[PDB]
């Protein structure tokens, strides 16, 4: 299954 | 007769099931023909298969035992298929294998315990499968292993401490399983390790102090687990670290001042933890830093002035803390700043004039602080600006002219500030502005006459500002779908050419001083669903045609001076409260029958 990579993508 | 290489390949053809295109060309005519076959590379002398590539051929089924006869195979790639069943132990008899990649399949059950027989294995990639049970301790015996990927499955338990003894390991990836317990300190013994990706698991405890011995580590990620306690101070000794992701955990305490020693750090993300205290002023020395993220912690105090002159800083995220004081007045001067979000803090003072020094700033989010003073004219020359959210501050003065000239400006929220005087007329001429909220200010002025000629512009609100005078004619009101003008002092009549707003869906003109009649053209609007014209001085009838406007779900005209019968059709099924406080209005709907 897919797994997140990189910095936290949260945004305003 | 037939070479075992040929028969072994043909076994694969018949053991795996895919589309006809999968093995079309694996054809035997009427010697060493298999060397022309796609995915097959042979030793040019002996004709044996040394590399076999069946990646991304839409295959399913199981690996047949006959694969063991491909005995001088070095490279094997089965990735991006639908292979199932337990991992096939016959692969362990391919004892010359240097590269084995089975990523992106559906292999399941426990991982079989025979992999040490693959003595010369350099690269092992099993990313994204269905394995479960314990992580195979067996892989500990692979003394030449350089790259190990076991992520994206459902492996449980702890990380075998024995993995510490993989003396030539450079890359390890175990992210996205159900691993738990404490990270074994023995992993700090991996001298040549450069990449450690192990988050999206359930690890508890801290990060082992002996991890500070991974002198070669360039990339470290243990985000989205259950780590807690203080950040380990000793991680300062890691002078090659380029990437540090520790977000979405439960660390507490202060950020160690020793992290100022991470001179090659580029990305730092401590989002969503429970850190407190102040950003270490030693962060001013992290000159390679490009992405600084501390979203959603319990941080406080002032941002060190020096983070405003980090030369490489591109992305600055501090929202959802409680920082105080002003923004470093030189922030932006590096010519490199692209996106910045410091919303929901307690910042004071002015917005620095240099935020956009190199035309790279595209996202500026400032909302919910206590920024004050005038809005910097320099933002009106921020050529690259796209999204600007600065609502809920104390920004005062006239909103400057200039924003109409920015080709990519598309979202502007300046609501709930303390702005005065004219709204800029050039807002009506900005080429791609889609959202513009000016609600809750103190203009004491008319709308710009040209307002409704905004080409793209879908949502426009200026409710509860202090708007006066009359609503401009709705000339070509091209892409609007939401208009909010409640709670002002608008007078005169609703413009009768409102029918130009073909895309309109919600319209709130309530709580003004509008008079005259309801414009008939509202009936010709294709998609209108919400109308609120309550608390005004409107007179006249509600046009009968409104009853055949199939799309209307809300039509609040309460507290007016309308008269005549409430229409019937759609209007038969609406809330009676929409029609109250209108002495002259009548109809079965509202309980006062007609005549
Ligand atoms: C296996 O094949 C895929 C698809 O061609 C490729 O992208 C991947 O890097 C290969 N794996 C190895 C270990 O070379
Ligand atoms: C590495 O760096 C810091 C510098 O303050 C030092 O004090 C710390 O004890 C070192 N880590 C260890 C325990 O080896
Ligand atoms: C604002 O930030 C605080 C942390 O200081 C947080 O607790 C709160 O939820 C944030 N506001 C929201 C709900 O966005
Ligand atoms: C944030 O800091 C200010 C200054 O002390 C304080 O008055 C305010 O209440 C703080 N907010 C929170 C979330 O504690
Ligand atoms: C405008 O801004 C966004 C975000 O930077 C970008 O994806 C888009 O392509 C830009 N378009 C133009 C005209 O530069
Ligand atoms: C405009 O801003 C006001 C006040 O900030 C807010 O409450 C409202 O939801 C916004 N309107 C729209 C359409 O986003
Ligand atoms: C609306 O208010 C202004 C301000 O006094 C007044 O001069 C003007 O005549 C009014 N317009 C209408 C149509 O009543
Ligand atoms: C119109 O605005 C008033 C004032 O905020 C509000 O109470 C009502 O929910 C709004 N109605 C619609 C349909 O937007």
Describe the overall structure.
Chain B: This is Leucine-rich repeat receptor-like protein kinase TDR. The complex is a heterodimer of chains A (12) and B (595). Chain A has 12 residues and is low in regular secondary structure. Chain B is mainly beta. Chain B has one domain (1-595). Chain B is 3% helix and 23% strand. Chain B has 2 helices and 43 strands. In chain B, the strands form 8 sheets. Chain B has a 23-stranded mixed sheet, with no helix packed on it. Chain B has a 5-stranded parallel sheet with strand order 18-20-22-24-26, with no helix packed on it. Chain B is extended. Chains A and B meet through loops of A and loops of B.
Map the helices and strands.
The complex is a heterodimer of chains A (12) and B (595).
Chain A: no helix or strand
Chain B: H1 4-15, E1 16-17, H2 20-23, E2 40-42, E3 49-53, E4 60-61, E5 75-77, E6 84-85, E7 99-101, E8 106-107, E9 123-125, E10 132-134, E11 147-149, E12 154-157, E13 171-173, E14 178-182, E15 195-197, E16 202-204, E17 219-221, E18 228-230, E19 243-245, E20 250-253, E21 267-269, E22 274-277, E23 291-293, E24 298-301, E25 315-317, E26 322-323, E27 339-341, E28 363-365, E29 372-374, E30 387-389, E31 394-398, E32 411-413, E33 418-420, E34 435-437, E35 459-461, E36 468-470, E37 482-484, E38 489-491, E39 506-508, E40 530-532, E41 554-556, E42 563-565, E43 584-586
Parallel strand pairs in B: 3-5, 5-7, 6-8, 7-9, 9-11, 10-12, 11-13, 12-14, 13-15, 14-16, 15-17, 17-19, 18-20, 19-21, 20-22, 21-23, 22-24, 23-25, 24-26, 25-27, 27-28, 28-30, 29-31, 30-32, 31-33, 32-34, 34-35, 35-37, 36-38, 37-39, 39-40, 40-41, 42-43
Antiparallel strand pairs in B: 1-4, 2-3
One 2-acetamido-2-deoxy-beta-D-glucopyranose binds at residues 391, 415-416, 437, 439-440, 459, 461, 482, 484 of chain B.
PDB class: transferase
Keywords: PXY, tdif, CLE peptides, leucine rich repeat, transferase
Assembly: dimeric
């Amino acid at each position: 299954h897919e797994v997140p990579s990189g910095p936290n993508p949260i945004s305003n | 007769k037939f070479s075992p290489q040929l028969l072994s390949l043909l076994s694969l053809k018949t053991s795996l099931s895919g589309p006809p295109s999968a093995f079309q060309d694996w054809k035997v005519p009427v010697d060493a023909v298999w060397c022309s076959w796609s995915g097959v590379v042979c030793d040019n002398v002996t004709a044996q298969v040394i590399s076999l590539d069946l990646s991304h051929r839409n295959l399913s089924g199981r690996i047949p035992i006959q694969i063991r006869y491909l005995s001088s195979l070095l490279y094997l790639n089965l990735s991006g298929n639908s292979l199932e069943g337990s991992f096939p132990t016959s692969i362990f008899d391919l004892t010359k294998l240097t590269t084995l990649d089975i990523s992106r399949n559906s292999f399941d059950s426990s991982f079989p315990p025979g992999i040490s027989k693959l003595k010369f294995l350099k690269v092992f990639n099993a990313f994204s499968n269905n394995f479960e049970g314990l992580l195979p301790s067996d892989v500990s015996r692979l003394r030449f292993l350089e790259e190990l990927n076991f992520g994206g499955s459902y492996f449980e338990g702890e990380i075998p401490a024995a993995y510490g003894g993989l003396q030539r390991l450079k890359f390890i990836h175990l992210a996205g399983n159900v691993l738990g317990g404490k990270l074994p300190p023995r992993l700090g013994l991996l001298t040549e390790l450069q990449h450690m990706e192990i988050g999206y698991n359930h690890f508890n405890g801290n990060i082992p102090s002996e991890f500070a011995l991974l002198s070669n580590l360039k990339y470290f990620d243990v985000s989205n687990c259950s780590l807690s306690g203080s950040l380990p101070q000793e991680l300062g000794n890691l002078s090659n670290l380029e990437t540090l992701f520790l977000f979405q955990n439960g660390f507490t305490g202060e950020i160690p001042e020793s992290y100022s020693n991470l001179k090659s750090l580029k990305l730092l993300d401590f989002s969503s933890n429970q850190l407190s205290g102040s950003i270490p002023s030693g962060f001013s020395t992290l000159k390679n830093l490009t992405w600084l993220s501390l979203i959603s912690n319990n941080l406080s105090g002032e941002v060190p002035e020096g983070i405003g002159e980090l030369p490489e800083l591109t992305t600055l995220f501090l929202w959802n803390n409680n920082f105080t004081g002003v923004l470093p007045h030189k922030l932006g001067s590096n010519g490199k700043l692209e996106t910045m979000d410091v919303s929901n803090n307690s910042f004071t003072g002015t917005i620095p004039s240099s935020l956009c020094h190199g035309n790279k700033l595209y996202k500026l989010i400032l909302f919910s602080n206590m920024f004050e003073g005038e809005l910097p004219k320099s933002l009106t020359r921020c050529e690259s600006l796209w999204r600007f959210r600065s609502q809920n501050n104390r920004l005062n003065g006239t909103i400057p002219i200039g924003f109409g000239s920015l080709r990519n400006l598309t979202f502007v929220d300046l609501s709930n500030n303390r702005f005065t005087d004219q709204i800029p007329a050039d807002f009506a001429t900005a080429p791609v502005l889609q959202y513009l909220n000016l609600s809750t200010n103190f203009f004491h002025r008319k709308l710009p006459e040209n307002i409704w000629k905004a080409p793209n512009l879908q949502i426009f609100s200026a409710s509860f500002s202090n708007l006066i005078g009359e609503i401009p004619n709705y000339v070509g009101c091209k892409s609007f779908y939401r208009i909010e003008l409640q709670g002002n002092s608008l007078n005169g009549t609703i413009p009768w050419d409102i029918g130009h707003c073909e895309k309109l869906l919600c319209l709130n003109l309530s709580q003004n001083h509008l008079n005259g009649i309801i414009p008939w053209e509202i009936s010709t609007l294709p998609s209108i669903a919400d109308v609120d014209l309550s608390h005004n001085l409107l007179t006249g009838t509600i046009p009968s045609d409104f009853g055949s406007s199939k799309t209307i779900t809300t039509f609040n005209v309460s507290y007016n001076q309308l008269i005549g019968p409430i229409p019937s059709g759609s209007f038969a099924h609406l809330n009676p409260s929409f029609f109250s406080s209108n002495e002259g209005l009548c109809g079965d709907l509202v309980g006062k029958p007609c005549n």
